[PDB]
């Protein structure tokens, strides 16, 4: 759970990278919350198509 905040903050600011999104998704999967993970993935796609 302590990851998420950092991801929300630091990834958003400077890097804006795909790997981060993937990591987040993985984390979500690990702790159930599938819908949330899906949403995150979608967001990532929207932001970084390639």
Resolution (A): 3.6
First to last CA, the chain: 28
Give every CB contact of residue 7 below 8 A, 6+ residues apart in sequence: 20, 23, 24
- The structure was resolved experimentally with cryo-EM
C-alpha to C-alpha distance for 48 and 33, rounded to whole angstroms: 23
CB-count burial class (<10 Å; 0-12, 13-18, 19+) for 24: buried
C-alpha to C-alpha distance for 19 and 13, rounded to whole angstroms: 15
């Amino acid at each position: 759970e302590a990851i998420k905040f950092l991801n929300e903050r630091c990834l958003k600011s400077f890097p804006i990278c795909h790997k981060f999104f993937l990591q987040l998704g993985q984390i979500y999967h690990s702790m159930g919350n599938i819908e949330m993970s899906r949403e995150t993935y979608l967001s990532g796609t929207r932001l970084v198509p390639n």
